[PDB]
Point group: C2
Chain length 59, copies 2
């Protein structure tokens, strides 16, 4: 549990998120079975999809 | 895909997050197969766990 929250903080820091988003890092990493690489890839996919939805809709 | 992003925005708004966190709503809701109730429950679990780790560690 303690180590898991350590990975959560690593993920948080990689993406320059504030501590208030630790709950979201918890969910994403738990969903990915504590696979930090896969969690990172997933966040990058979200960032892409959101960015392009915005660009392709005048945002 | 368009409707999926509307659900992501509904989840974003429920938890009072700014637009910048849409990528995280995308991941969590995708992981939950677009089940918004389950996405909510999971974020609530993360909120509990993080809050409890903080309280039980002087934060």
């Amino acid at each position: 549990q303690d180590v898991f929250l350590d990975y959560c903080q690593k993920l948080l820091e990689k993406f320059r998120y504030p501590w208030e988003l630790m709950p979201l890092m918890y969910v994403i990493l738990k969903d990915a079975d504590a696979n930090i690489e896969e969690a990172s890839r997933r966040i990058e996919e979200g960032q892409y999809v959101v960015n392009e939805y915005s660009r392709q809709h005048n945002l």
